[PDB]
Amino acid sequence: SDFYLPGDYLLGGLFSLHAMCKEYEVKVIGYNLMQAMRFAVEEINNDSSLLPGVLLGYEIVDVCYISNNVQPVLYFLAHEDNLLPIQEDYSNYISRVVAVIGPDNSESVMTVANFLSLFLLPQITYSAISDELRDKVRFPALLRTTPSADHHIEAMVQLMLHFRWNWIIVLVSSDTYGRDNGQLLGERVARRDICIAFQETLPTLQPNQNMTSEERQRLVTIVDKLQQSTARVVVVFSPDLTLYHFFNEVLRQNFTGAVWIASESWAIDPVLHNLTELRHLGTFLGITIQSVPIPGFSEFREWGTCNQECDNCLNATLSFNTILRLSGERVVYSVYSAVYAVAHALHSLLGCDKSTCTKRVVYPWQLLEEIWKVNFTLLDHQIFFDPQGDVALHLEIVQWQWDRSQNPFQSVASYYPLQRQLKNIQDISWHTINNTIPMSMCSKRCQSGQKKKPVGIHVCCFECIDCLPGTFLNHTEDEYECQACPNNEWSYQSETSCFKRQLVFLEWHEAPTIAVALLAALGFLSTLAILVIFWRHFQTPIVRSAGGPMCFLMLTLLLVAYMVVPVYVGPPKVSTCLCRQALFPLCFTICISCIAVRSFQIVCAFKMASRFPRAYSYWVRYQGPYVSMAFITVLKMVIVVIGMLATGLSPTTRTDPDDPKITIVSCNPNYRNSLLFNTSLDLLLSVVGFSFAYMGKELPTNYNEAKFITLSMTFYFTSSVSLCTFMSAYSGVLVTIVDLLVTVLNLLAISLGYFGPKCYMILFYPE
Amino acid sequence: LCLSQQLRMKGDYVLGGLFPLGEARTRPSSPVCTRFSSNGLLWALAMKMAVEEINNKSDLLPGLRLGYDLFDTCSEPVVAMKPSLMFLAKAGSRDIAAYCNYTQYQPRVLAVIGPHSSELAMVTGKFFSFFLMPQVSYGASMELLSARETFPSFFRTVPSDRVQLTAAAELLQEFGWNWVAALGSDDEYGRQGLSIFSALAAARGICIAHEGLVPLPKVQDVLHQVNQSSVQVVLLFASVHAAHALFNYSISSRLSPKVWVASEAWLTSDLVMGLPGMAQMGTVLGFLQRGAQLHEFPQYVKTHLALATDPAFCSALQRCPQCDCITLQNVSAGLNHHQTFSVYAAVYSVAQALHNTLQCNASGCPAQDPVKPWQLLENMYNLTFHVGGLPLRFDSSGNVDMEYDLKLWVWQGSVPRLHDVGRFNGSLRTERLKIRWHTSDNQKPVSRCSRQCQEGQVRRVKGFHSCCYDCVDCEAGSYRQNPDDIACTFCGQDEWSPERSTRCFRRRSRFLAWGEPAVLLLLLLLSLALGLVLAALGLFVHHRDSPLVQASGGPLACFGLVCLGLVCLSVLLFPGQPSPARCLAQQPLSHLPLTGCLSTLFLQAAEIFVESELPLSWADRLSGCLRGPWAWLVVLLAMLVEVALCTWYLVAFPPEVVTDWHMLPTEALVHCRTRSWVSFGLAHATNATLAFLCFLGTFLVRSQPGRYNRARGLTFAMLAYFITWVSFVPLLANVQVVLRPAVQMGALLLCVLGILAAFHLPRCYLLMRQPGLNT
Numbered sequence A: 001s002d003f004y005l006p007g008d009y010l011l012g013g014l015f016s017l018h019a020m021c022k023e024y025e026v027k028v029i030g031y032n033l034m035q036a037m038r039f040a041v042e043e044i045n046n047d048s049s050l051l052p053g054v055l056l057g058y059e060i061v062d063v064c065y066i067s068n069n070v071q072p073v074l075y076f077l078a079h080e081d082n083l084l085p086i087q088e089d090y091s092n093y094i095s096r097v098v099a100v101i102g103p104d105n106s107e108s109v110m111t112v113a114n115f116l117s118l119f120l121l122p123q124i125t126y127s128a129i130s131d132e133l134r135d136k137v138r139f140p141a142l143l144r145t146t147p148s149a150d151h152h153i154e155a156m157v158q159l160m161l162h163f164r165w166n167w168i169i170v171l172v173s174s175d176t177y178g179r180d181n182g183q184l185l186g187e188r189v190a191r192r193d194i195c196i197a198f199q200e201t202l203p204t205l206q207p208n209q210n211m212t213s214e215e216r217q218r219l220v221t222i223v224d225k226l227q228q229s230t231a232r233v234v235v236v237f238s239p240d241l242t243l244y245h246f247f248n249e250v251l252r253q254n255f256t257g258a259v260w261i262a263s264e265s266w267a268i269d270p271v272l273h274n275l276t277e278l279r280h281l282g283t284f285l286g287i288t289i290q291s292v293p294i295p296g297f298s299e300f301r302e303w304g305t306c307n308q309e310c311d312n313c314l315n316a317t318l319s320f321n322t323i324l325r326l327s328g329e330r331v332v333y334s335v336y337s338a339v340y341a342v343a344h345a346l347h348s349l350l351g352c353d354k355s356t357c358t359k360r361v362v363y364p365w366q367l368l369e370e371i372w373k374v375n376f377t378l379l380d381h382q383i384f385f386d387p388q389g390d391v392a393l394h395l396e397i398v399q400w401q402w403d404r405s406q407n408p409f410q411s412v413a414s415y416y417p418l419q420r421q422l423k424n425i426q427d428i429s430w431h432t433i434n435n436t437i438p439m440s441m442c443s444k445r446c447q448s449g450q451k452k453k454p455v456g457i458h459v460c461c462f463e464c465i466d467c468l469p470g471t472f473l474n475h476t477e478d479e480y481e482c483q484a485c486p487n488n489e490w491s492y493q494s495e496t497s498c499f500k501r502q503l504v505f506l507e508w509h510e511a512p513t514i515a516v517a518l519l520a521a522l523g524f525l526s527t528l529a530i531l532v533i534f535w536r537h538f539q540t541p542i543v544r545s546a547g548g549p550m551c552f553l554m555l556t557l558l559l560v561a562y563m564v565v566p567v568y569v570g571p572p573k574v575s576t577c578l579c580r581q582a583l584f585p586l587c588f589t590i591c592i593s594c595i596a597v598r599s600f601q602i603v604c605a606f607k608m609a610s611r612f613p614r615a616y617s618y619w620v621r622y623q624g625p626y627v628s629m630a631f632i633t634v635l636k637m638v639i640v641v642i643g644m645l646a647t648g649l650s651p652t653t654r655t656d657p658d659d660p661k662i663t664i665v666s667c668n669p670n671y672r673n674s675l676l677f678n679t680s681l682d683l684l685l686s687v688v689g690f691s692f693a694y695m696g697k698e699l700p701t702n703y704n705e706a707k708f709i710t711l712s713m714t715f716y717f718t719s720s721v722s723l724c725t726f727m728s729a730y731s732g733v734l735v736t737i738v739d740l741l742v743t744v745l746n747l748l749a750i751s752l753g754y755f756g757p758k759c760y761m762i763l764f765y766p767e
Numbered sequence B: 001l002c003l004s005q006q007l008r009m010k011g012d013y014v015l016g017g018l019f020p021l022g023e024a025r026t027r028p029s030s031p032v033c034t035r036f037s038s039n040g041l042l043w044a045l046a047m048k049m050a051v052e053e054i055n056n057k058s059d060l061l062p063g064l065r066l067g068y069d070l071f072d073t074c075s076e077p078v079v080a081m082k083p084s085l086m087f088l089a090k091a092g093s094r095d096i097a098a099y100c101n102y103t104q105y106q107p108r109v110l111a112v113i114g115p116h117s118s119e120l121a122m123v124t125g126k127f128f129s130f131f132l133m134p135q136v137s138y139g140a141s142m143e144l145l146s147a148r149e150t151f152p153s154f155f156r157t158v159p160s161d162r163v164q165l166t167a168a169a170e171l172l173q174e175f176g177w178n179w180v181a182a183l184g185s186d187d188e189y190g191r192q193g194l195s196i197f198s199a200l201a202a203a204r205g206i207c208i209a210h211e212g213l214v215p216l217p218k219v220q221d222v223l224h225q226v227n228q229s230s231v232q233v234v235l236l237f238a239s240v241h242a243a244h245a246l247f248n249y250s251i252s253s254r255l256s257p258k259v260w261v262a263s264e265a266w267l268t269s270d271l272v273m274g275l276p277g278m279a280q281m282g283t284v285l286g287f288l289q290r291g292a293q294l295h296e297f298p299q300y301v302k303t304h305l306a307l308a309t310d311p312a313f314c315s316a317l318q319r320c321p322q323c324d325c326i327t328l329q330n331v332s333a334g335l336n337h338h339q340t341f342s343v344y345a346a347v348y349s350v351a352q353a354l355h356n357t358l359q360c361n362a363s364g365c366p367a368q369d370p371v372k373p374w375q376l377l378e379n380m381y382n383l384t385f386h387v388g389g390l391p392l393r394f395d396s397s398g399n400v401d402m403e404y405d406l407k408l409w410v411w412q413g414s415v416p417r418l419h420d421v422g423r424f425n426g427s428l429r430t431e432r433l434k435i436r437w438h439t440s441d442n443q444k445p446v447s448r449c450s451r452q453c454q455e456g457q458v459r460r461v462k463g464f465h466s467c468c469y470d471c472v473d474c475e476a477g478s479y480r481q482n483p484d485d486i487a488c489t490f491c492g493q494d495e496w497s498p499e500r501s502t503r504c505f506r507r508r509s510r511f512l513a514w515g516e517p518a519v520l521l522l523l524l525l526l527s528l529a530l531g532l533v534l535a536a537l538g539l540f541v542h543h544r545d546s547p548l549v550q551a552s553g554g555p556l557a558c559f560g561l562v563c564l565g566l567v568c569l570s571v572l573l574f575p576g577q578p579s580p581a582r583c584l585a586q587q588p589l590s591h592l593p594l595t596g597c598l599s600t601l602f603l604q605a606a607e608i609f610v611e612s613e614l615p616l617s618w619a620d621r622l623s624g625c626l627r628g629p630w631a632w633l634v635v636l637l638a639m640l641v642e643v644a645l646c647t648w649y650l651v652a653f654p655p656e657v658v659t660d661w662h663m664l665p666t667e668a669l670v671h672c673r674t675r676s677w678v679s680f681g682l683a684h685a686t687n688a689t690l691a692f693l694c695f696l697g698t699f700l701v702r703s704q705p706g707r708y709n710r711a712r713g714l715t716f717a718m719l720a721y722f723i724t725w726v727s728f729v730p731l732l733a734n735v736q737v738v739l740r741p742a743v744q745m746g747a748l749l750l751c752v753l754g755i756l757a758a759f760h761l762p763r764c765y766l767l768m769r770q771p772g773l774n775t
């Protein structure tokens, strides 16, 4: 039969022909790889440059997926008489086979390598991707012709990164394959800023049998939890057998819009593509080995003890001939390269010089030692074994195309294990409306100048909350928290660049301030002329019966107040406010006190002289108005000093509600209470002064003093009430100019309503 | 000592043996382990004791001798494979043939006492299963060894990990911690435990917040992920070393205390148990096995050690060459080891299966051909064997059944002790009244997820699986647009929303309506003011020829009364729906007649002042001109200047009917608003100046007793005007915005009432009641 070929050195094989093994259903891939190995050995026999004059044989034994993994290896290690000796050292042992091409799945390879470790027979497994075969401590004589699952996971991660998918879904199987792949991908993905929405285990369910109600509920739960999630990249680590029911129920629930990523198990499975209803679910990417065109192999394949036979293999392979031919060869080159690796190792071990061979007896451990160091070329591919027993064959991301006229599995990317880089990506026919890359992000990109706030355990998921007014976001420093701008400058909503608050204050060249300046200059000129006239006429009954020194000091203090009026306008400094609050309130209060004491002494003194005679005698012996004036003045310095100690001295900066962009500057941080106290004292003096004037309003006294005092004092009362109501009903930029207006007009009242009629009767009434 | 010489014993049926007697390439030579292991020798002596006791008993295997081959297997499988091949080789020959199936084999050992390690047990069982060799393995626990598809001949005497993981899941479900974190060691033990616990938790409704693998002696990432979720119960299904490393790192980092559900690996390990600072890591509730102990094993082993020390016996009579150069204190550390009973019961189970297969009684046991190893399997399922007075059974999957004990750690003087607070025999039964927790009080640490979200909430999927929803309440102004939405959506800013609401409610306008009680009281005040105005007007037009009105104006008095009435009438337009024309014309129609009345009163005041405090020379010219056609011209000039100013600040200052969508909580606002203090301030400037000049010219006068005081009414009218508006301004500045037109109305109405009661009321009083003074 074709399962045996005598030669100088046999070369055992282990292929999964069914999934005794005869009663199981036949598999086409096993026979395909079997024919690959046969063709490789046959072409080794043909080639006179490789192994010249040394016939190479083989002994292929059918092994099931799991069931048969012990008897074939014992057959391999038995002598020609079917007896395997037991001894401590096997260096002198000669086995029937010289090497073995291991099974196609991880577990049977693990068993065969565990049992062959004693003898150190080389074993080049193919398409076994488990990473527990990477270490040579427990598998000293195990090799590979297929990149490990590490590179499959790396290709998947690079594919997600290239298309900007950072929110995925992992589905595994109850088997060890799915569990290990899921854990490996989860460990790999946590360091590339890609999150896993959820990982779920698909129950094991072989086809061609009826499912249970509990499993149906399980699947409907899986697909419900799949659909309710916002991730649109579903990676599946599961053998192709149990994925029929899951996809059937997915079609049943009518779920669409997911980019399925397939592991190597079902990325090239024909039957799932043959279902031909998956084309509406979305795109079906997958990871698989690059197809290497083996010359003169399709024609060779088409030309053609126990558990060592098959009958229905050819009939089964007949139906899948066209799909296999158009799809190319994926795992066939793995077996081809493994057989050539053994051949090159044996050729180098025999020390052949492409014409002669020493034909020395070969121990399998010697062949392993030589095969660990093979580096040749094969179909423009370099075949060399890495120190952990692998050869870097290019991987490939393949996108399923539902058209029988061309390749059912069309390549879209190539992965190079040596560089760990995925490159050469072509166009992919997506499932979107206008062929746009599907979006699989959990959190939208935040608008410029917006704080990022994590919402769950996943780092890539967050909520965008805008920065509150007065702060921005420095993306360079940290994008998770707002950073406010120092130096007393404000920021608007969603603003990343704080702007300096412009300092607005009373400037010389403005309309209200120039009006105030003109009014104050008119008052100053009028009162200066009044002083000039008063000094021009003295020894006059009006200026002598009334207080001469009193009026002179009052008018000089009014002159000073007018001259210091313009210090208000300009940049508010410490000296500015100091002189302002030490001159204006002092002078104004001293003027009001003099007016009140004059009205008192001209009206109420006559009435008081009747009840208290000695009080009047004391008042006239001394200078009662002078001492009362000094007492009120010292009270005023005391109160201004205590307000000084309370409210401070440095000019303040307050943000008006009108516009945070502007910042008015006054000199008193607490102006409301300070002006309230000042006006309270002024009005407490004003009420008694006005009452004293009004009780004696008709008396001629010193040329109708009570009448003018009354009119001026009522004018001040109304102006103070106007200030109070304006301040209570308004707070903004015009507060300072209003304070100037009211202060200067109060000064005008005190000047005019108490000195202007004097000048009137002096100039126009010389009688 | 030659203790190793007894590792063989001839008999009709001889058992195998794989024990860890030793401990730890280019050539195919098996590595040799020279390090000595006390546990392996204790187990081998235990099985030797069991075999000797079987041979002592006459009711078990009568008239037969049972032997054993105690072979050394290091933890490595390469050194353990050769004893297996030796077992399967034909007796008396040193080779094993490769036949098609098991039936052609005649193994030299009836059964094999499998390896303690489970990683070795996998390979050994997979090799033996081809020949259907009965294997009973002490200590092999992980579950997939029970799969009869790949291990048809593999039995065991320790419970699988499935039973203890089911016990842990039932514990978590019974105490109510349905939101836990599962951890496992990096080896196969932890991975299998995590997978099994994943399945069990998914079945039982428990969710796993985070599934991570603690690496063998990274950890920082696993601890950070565990702490990221609000989980207070962590199942640590790890080996001794991984658990020790985890707990040491948590000690260094000062992790918050948690309820660690302990696997049997590290629950009773003294390395983890005596770790410094361990008392600050919460309660540790594990499920220790409940298995008997050989009460006579130490005496037996000490007797045979002393007896092998005797040269006579052993001289009268390798696998473990290091076992000969040992002494008694090199093994005394582990005499009370619970795997001794597992080995003892495995030997008894094999012997009982052999006895049943020979189907023979206590008196004797009939002669027959020697029984093949694979013939034991048909009789070793359902097997019921008594080991020291305790019955045990082999399930259909080769797993023995025994119960567990829920043991927690207690702490007094930093000395931890184990205490029984439960029992798992297939149905957990805990005594939680005596359990002492780590919380500040004796309260169970809450760790729970919301399986479903209450109506009106947004749901956010949590857990490693999409298990439980983090129900979140979001503030007012938002609603749950769809049940599947992650976050609630705002609505159109023109409609309010209550807290915890599925949908928004439309905002409806609420202005100053005609039915408001304040509106009613001000309408009553308006009607009273109108009645007073009409009465005064009738009085002044009836007695028009009297000196009263003649001195107090005349036609000007009636004109001012009509103006006051028209101000009262124009007060009526403030309320209601704020039509744009109405809001625009509020101020001018509320100010023109008031300006007219104020100007009339000011002309009266000016006449009084001229006749009072002016020289007669100017008086004879001013008095004769200030009354009559020139008075009409003056009041007309006042009215036209007011009208010009009114049109100026209506064309310049726009009075806007704004709709404040975000002032009232649940209802809309329609506000008639004008410029702040500038519009109505400029409108009030003329009235203020007229009133101020009137007050100034009137509030001093000489009122001789022989004349009527024509100034008191004017002074008090002007005073009332000033005080009512001064008090009004802060009322405008502080009253809630809806009642702002009502405050406007009150200002105007009190203004009219004050001017009436001060100026016109005193005149009318003497006009009606005492007409004897009108000369």
Ligand SMILES: *[C@@H]1O[C@H](CO)[C@@H](O)[C@H](O)[C@H]1NC(C)=O
Pocket (backbone or CB within 6 Å): A042, A043, A046, A296, A300
């Ligand atoms: C070479 O191999 C082919 C198949 O590839 C086989 O048919 C043929 O007999 C071999 N020998 C020669 C000399 O062609």
Ligand SMILES: *[C@@H]1O[C@H](CO)[C@@H](O)[C@H](O)[C@H]1NC(C)=O
Pocket (backbone or CB within 6 Å): A208, A209, A210, A211
């Ligand atoms: C279940 O599957 C079996 C096996 O093919 C089939 O005969 C049967 O019709 C299916 N349905 C039910 C309801 O049993």
Ligand SMILES: *[C@@H]1O[C@H](CO)[C@@H](O)[C@H](O)[C@H]1NC(C)=O
Pocket (backbone or CB within 6 Å): A252, A253, A254
């Ligand atoms: C689409 O989904 C609906 C709702 O689940 C389902 O009833 C229907 O069968 C699905 N397929 C089609 C073709 O409508």
Ligand SMILES: *[C@@H]1O[C@H](CO)[C@@H](O)[C@H](O)[C@H]1NC(C)=O
Pocket (backbone or CB within 6 Å): A273, A274, A275, A276, A319, A320
């Ligand atoms: C291939 O897919 C088709 C389309 O559904 C299906 O009918 C056929 O059975 C599949 N298998 C083959 C041709 O082997």
Ligand SMILES: *[C@@H]1O[C@H](CO)[C@@H](O)[C@H](O)[C@H]1NC(C)=O
Pocket (backbone or CB within 6 Å): A311, A312, A314, A315
């Ligand atoms: C293949 O199937 C045909 C019928 O289509 C049958 O006659 C033939 O024997 C089969 N070949 C086998 C089983 O090798």
Ligand SMILES: *[C@@H]1O[C@H](CO)[C@@H](O)[C@H](O)[C@H]1NC(C)=O
Pocket (backbone or CB within 6 Å): A375, A376, A382, A384
């Ligand atoms: C194999 O040989 C080629 C050709 O000289 C060389 O480029 C390559 O690096 C070699 N590989 C190793 C692993 O030495």
Ligand SMILES: *[C@@H]1O[C@H](CO)[C@@H](O)[C@H](O)[C@H]1NC(C)=O
Pocket (backbone or CB within 6 Å): A433, A434
């Ligand atoms: C795709 O193509 C159509 C037709 O030209 C175009 O109108 C549409 O905007 C495109 N789709 C998208 C999502 O941009």
Ligand SMILES: *[C@@H]1O[C@H](CO)[C@@H](O)[C@H](O)[C@H]1NC(C)=O
Pocket (backbone or CB within 6 Å): A474, A476, A477
């Ligand atoms: C923002 O970060 C940059 C880069 O570190 C730094 O130079 C700068 O001072 C930070 N602040 C602002 C206000 O730009």
Ligand SMILES: *[C@@H]1O[C@H](CO)[C@@H](O)[C@H](O)[C@H]1NC(C)=O
Pocket (backbone or CB within 6 Å): B049, B050, B052, B053, B056
């Ligand atoms: C077996 O019985 C003998 C006496 O016949 C006794 O010395 C020995 O200790 C027994 N073996 C045991 C208990 O293992």
Ligand SMILES: *[C@@H]1O[C@H](CO)[C@@H](O)[C@H](O)[C@H]1NC(C)=O
Pocket (backbone or CB within 6 Å): B100, B101, B102, B103
């Ligand atoms: C084992 O193989 C032999 C081959 O001669 C066969 O006769 C026998 O029935 C087989 N026994 C089994 C399959 O149990």
Ligand SMILES: *[C@@H]1O[C@H](CO)[C@@H](O)[C@H](O)[C@H]1NC(C)=O
Pocket (backbone or CB within 6 Å): B227, B228, B253, B254, B255, B256
């Ligand atoms: C653990 O989480 C808490 C709560 O979020 C946090 O305060 C703490 O810093 C975290 N880390 C440690 C080591 O406790």
Ligand SMILES: *[C@@H]1O[C@H](CO)[C@@H](O)[C@H](O)[C@H]1NC(C)=O
Pocket (backbone or CB within 6 Å): B248, B249, B252
């Ligand atoms: C415990 O953790 C500390 C801090 O990480 C580490 O340095 C130390 O080696 C650990 N202890 C042991 C006994 O390994």
Ligand SMILES: *[C@@H]1O[C@H](CO)[C@@H](O)[C@H](O)[C@H]1NC(C)=O
Pocket (backbone or CB within 6 Å): B036, B322, B325, B326, B327, B329, B330
């Ligand atoms: C017996 O114990 C001694 C003292 O600890 C030790 O030196 C010796 O190696 C031990 N023997 C062994 C391990 O075989």
Ligand SMILES: *[C@@H]1O[C@H](CO)[C@@H](O)[C@H](O)[C@H]1NC(C)=O
Pocket (backbone or CB within 6 Å): B360, B361, B362, B363, B364, B365, B366
């Ligand atoms: C049990 O079997 C033995 C051995 O054949 C026989 O001698 C004996 O009589 C039987 N019956 C009893 C009751 O022991």
Ligand SMILES: *[C@@H]1O[C@H](CO)[C@@H](O)[C@H](O)[C@H]1NC(C)=O
Pocket (backbone or CB within 6 Å): B381, B382, B396
């Ligand atoms: C033996 O096991 C079978 C399993 O099907 C069971 O039906 C039977 O009752 C068992 N016999 C016993 C426990 O005696």
Ligand SMILES: *[C@@H]1O[C@H](CO)[C@@H](O)[C@H](O)[C@H]1NC(C)=O
Pocket (backbone or CB within 6 Å): B423, B425, B426, B427, B429
């Ligand atoms: C387990 O023990 C309880 C008492 O704690 C008993 O009621 C129950 O029947 C037992 N169950 C089994 C399966 O042995």
